């Protein structure tokens, strides 16, 4: 179990750690988060009390270094840092734990929620989507645009998701225009899986990361990317059976975890109705269709 200690908490802020969140009051004696499960990526995120504008946060993996947060009064945010000096980190963290100034990552032992949402998410791939190579952790916020969004303006602060576009020469073979537009299996399996992603695990990992950036930061372009990657599978007549089984699990836990009050903006009616009711795979997502229909029948 690992620890993300804090220098202090100088401004009132709601802090999120994965799917958990708690309020810290201005200058409350808070010095970080402990007992964080090893083996998973994690995200620690922030929404200032004064300005609900800009949720932001840091994807990280405790196995990849010792990380601490210090608020920056010039830039006005909680910044993730690396403490190079392993010895100082242990000495400062032990100090904080003895005085019990840390919240405990509150995992119930029956609960596989986080694993299920992050199964295929790897820090190495996150860092290729979020380009900031000097840091082992990756910053995301609400306003960051995607590479495709900049094709339709600051390239360094972008989310470099894989571009998917159903009406593109990449997606459509000359002389198979109708075949490939109505059955995207060529684009899914040859262009994307075999060509770009190499395997379904990388595909699913980007898909899961897109969902989490949408849910946690209300990042609109991430939301678009998550929906595009679902649609690309649902609109393919030919999908490996294990990919559909796994997709149904993935989506199931995403839908289970979405806050009820945010469903109106995180869920695209057209995509979901198409995927569940019109697409080749309309009969292949039993778990996802069941939860969707019992929790958000309004959308359908």
């Amino acid at each position: 179990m690992n620890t993300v200690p804090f220098t202090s908490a100088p401004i009132e802020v709601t802090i999120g750690i994965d799917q958990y969140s708690f309020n810290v009051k201005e200058n409350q004696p808070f010095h970080g988060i402990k007992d964080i499960p090893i083996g998973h990526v994690h995200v620690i995120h922030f929404q200032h009390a004064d300005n609900s504008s800009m949720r932001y946060g840091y994807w990280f993996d405790c196995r990849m270094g010792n990380f601490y947060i210090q608020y920056d009064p010039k830039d006005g945010l909680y910044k993730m840092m690396e403490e190079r000096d392993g010895a100082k980190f242990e000495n400062i963290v032990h100090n904080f734990k003895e005085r019990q100034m840390m919240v405990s990552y509150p995992k119930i032992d029956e609960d596989d929620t986080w694993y299920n949402l992050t199964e295929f998410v790897q820090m190495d791939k996150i860092r290729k989507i979020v380009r900031k190579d000097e840091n082992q952790f990756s910053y995301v916020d609400s306003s960051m645009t995607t590479v495709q969004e900049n094709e339709l303006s600051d390239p360094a602060h972008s989310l470099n998701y894989t571009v998917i576009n159903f009406k593109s020469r990449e997606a459509i073979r000359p002389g198979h225009e109708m075949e490939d537009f109505l059955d995207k299996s060529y684009y899914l399996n040859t262009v994307m899986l075999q060509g770009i992603f190499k395997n379904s695990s990388n595909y699913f990992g980007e898909l899961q990361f897109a969902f989490l950036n949408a849910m946690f930061f209300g990042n609109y372009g991430s939301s678009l990317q998550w929906h595009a990657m679902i649609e690309l599978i649902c609109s393919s007549a030919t999908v490996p059976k294990h990919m559909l089984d796994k997709l149904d699990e993935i989506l199931y836990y995403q839908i289970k975890t979405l806050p009820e009050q945010y469903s109106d903006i995180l869920l695209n009616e057209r995509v979901w109705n198409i995927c569940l009711y019109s697409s080749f795979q309309k009969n292949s997502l039993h778990n996802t269709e069941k939860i969707m229909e019992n929790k958000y029948p309004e959308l359908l």
Binding site: K167, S168, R169, I172, E177, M178, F181
Partner: protein, 237 residues
């Protein structure tokens, strides 16, 4: 984006544009089978592709053989339309390629856009006009070449005959749409109007009769009447 009454003069500027109507591409007769079931029999069709400025009509005849062994023919017809329009554009010299293609039905947008991905500078556009181009097969000489075709075939026409020698393309299009609307609302009356007088002939190289300016006004008035009429007979007004 879409084309409507606000921007009707755009049709007659100097940017090359084509209208594409696919309503006569897939045509069937529905009939009973010996077992009392119902079946379709396809008949020859055509893509109606028309330059509204010049009057040039690229009439691509769809021979029934193109449906042999195919499924979901109403859907295939849209993609077949797009494929053949895409082929036409590619055959034209660059300076003759359209800058815009306007489709008369929104269901043609995606099929055409996909086929023309190679031409990203060509705008594919819908329209809110209810244009009467489906009545093209009420023009006897167009109907004749479609029904006689034994193979796929492109036939070129000028749907304005020689009108542009005397009137503008705005007026030529308005005449054409009036004639086609009339034929669509009541073909027999429309055709009676056009051919009642035996002394006004259709030249071998034309589609419509050789009316003088004065005769065209009478004709135009008679077709307006027909369309207001049938609109009564329809709505009892």
């Amino acid at each position: 984006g879409a084309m409507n009454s606000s921007n009707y003069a755009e049709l007659f500027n100097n940017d090359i544009k084509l209208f594409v109507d696919d309503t006569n591409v897939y045509r069937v007769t529905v009939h009973k089978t010996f077992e009392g079931n119902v079946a379709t029999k396809a008949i020859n069709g055509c893509i109606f592709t028309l330059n509204p400025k010049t009057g040039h009509l690229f009439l691509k005849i769809i021979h029934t053989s193109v449906w042999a062994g195919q499924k979901r023919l109403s859907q295939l017809a849209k993609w077949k339309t797009a494929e053949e329009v895409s082929a036409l554009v590619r055959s034209l010299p660059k300076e003759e390629q359209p800058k815009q293609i306007i489709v008369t039905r929104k269901a043609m947008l995606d099929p055409l856009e996909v086929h023309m991905l190679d031409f990203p500078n060509i705008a594919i556009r819908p329209t809110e006009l209810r244009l009467p181009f489906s009545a093209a097969m009420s023009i006897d000489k167009l109907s004749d070449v479609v029904m006689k075709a034994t193979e796929p075939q492109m036939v070129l026409f000028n749907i304005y005959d020689d009108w542009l020698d005397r009137i503008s393309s705005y007026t030529a299009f308005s005449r054409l749409t009036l004639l086609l609307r009339a034929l669509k609302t009541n073909e027999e009356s429309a055709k009676m109007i056009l051919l009642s007088d035996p002394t006004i002939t259709i030249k071998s190289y034309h589609l419509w009769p050789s009316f003088t300016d004065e005769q065209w006004i009478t004709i135009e008035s008679q077709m307006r009447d027909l369309i207001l009429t049938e609109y009564g007979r329809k709505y009892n007004v």
